[PDB]
């Protein structure tokens, strides 16, 4: 059952209409992640890979450190969730990517970010 | 126009039951916070301070550094919200206070937090 | 004695030959910072504000967040140390400063680091 | 040319006498790292690895997040540096380890720490 070093995310997704005008291509989604750790042990967030594809196959890439401007050591059984946003010329899209973590053992994993869907409600 | 540093806070109270004895005046809060960074620069939360006011004008102070142990570098348009609890002596009573911040230019400036409340939703 | 916040900080500069041109008036410092928490209760690092200044009278600034992509929370007694480096086109110069801090009752406070000169080993 | 991410380190061991007796096998060594960026891009220390040894091949292990509870960024060309302490049952050992670290692009690399001994003065 338990695992040592885990840790869970999960992201809703959401068009902004608010900002966002399709008439010149200007679509505007918001993802909120939120981090668990289900592991027996502590573990942090290092850096952060994102791969957003466009409504055409447009690939574009966001590589950098931390998760808004953070490293959180999280205990077993704490979350951490923020929400950023991500513009696309298109109303349809995917996101998926990867969290490199390290355990409280220094010993460092990656937690994967499946793949998920973006589009106008 | 648009300031460079800014942030927006908001609040969602919400009384827990399962958690509060009234029959002997204790009454436990569940709040969640909002900050979203409204500004065009980057900026960061670093410590906080309430002042929640009781039912019957008892004040109770907090000072800490962070929020729920984060002090989020929030870039324009990203927002980071966390879940905390709130103690009162009277089914009633409202939570205000400031968040000392510092843009990505290393400068502080204050963030308020506006007087909300915290009633039973009986 | 003995306050309830207090940062000190001590900086020594020094002269870096190894990879400074002096005939292309390319003169490169590296001074090395130690912060130390002399109060009676924690205290963190949050930002830090830099004058550098030329032979010629020249400012730069430098402004941004943390200590060598860090902000310590320093208990009282411990230190943080690292070292940066200063390029400057004359072969002296003064470099002061300021850190902004936050004591654990979450309280901003500044912590002034005092101005210092860089030459060339011997003035 | 030179590596994009690249990071050297340096140790200075020192015995300490004061904080130590020979006659009960208790040798407490002192030691100093400078970490230095010697690569193109930032570059960030997150966690270490020791693997310290006996006069007698005795091995004890050390793994944890940080140095001195710091995991430094460093620009090009900067260095952190701080001094922890390494109990030996003999007057003489290795300590040897690793670094894990991450460039600015989040990717991870490691920088290895080279066997280097521990031996008192005299």
Same mark, same amino acid.
């Given at each position: 059952?338990?695992?040592?070093?885990?840790?869970?995310?999960?992201?809703?997704?959401?068009?902004?209409?608010?900002?966002?005008?399709?008439?010149?291509?200007?679509? =505007?989604?918001? *993802?909120?992640?939120?981090?668990?750790?289900?592991?027996?042990?502590?573990?942090? =967030?290092?850096?952060? /890979?994102?791969?957003?594809?466009?409504?055409? %196959?447009?690939?574009?890439?966001?590589?950098?450190?931390?998760? =808004?401007?953070?490293?959180?050591?999280?205990?077993?059984? %704490?979350?951490? %969730?923020?929400?950023?946003?991500?513009?696309?010329?298109?109303?349809?899209?995917? $996101?998926?990517?990867? *969290? /490199?973590?390290?355990?409280?053992?220094?010993?460092?994993?990656? =937690?994967?970010?499946? %793949?998920?869907?973006?589009? $106008?409600?």
């Amino acid at each position: 059952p338990v695992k040592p070093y885990d840790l869970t995310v999960s992201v809703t997704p959401r068009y902004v209409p608010e900002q966002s005008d399709p008439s010149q291509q200007q679509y =505007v989604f918001a *993802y909120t992640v939120r981090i668990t750790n289900t592991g027996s042990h502590p573990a942090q =967030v290092i850096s952060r /890979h994102w791969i957003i594809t466009d409504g055409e %196959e447009r690939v574009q890439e966001v590589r950098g450190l931390g998760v =808004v401007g953070q490293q959180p050591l999280l205990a077993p059984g %704490e979350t951490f %969730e923020y929400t950023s946003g991500c513009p696309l010329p298109t109303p349809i899209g995917t $996101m998926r990517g990867t *969290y /490199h973590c390290v355990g409280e053992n220094g010993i460092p994993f990656e =937690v994967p970010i499946a %793949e998920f869907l973006l589009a $106008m409600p």
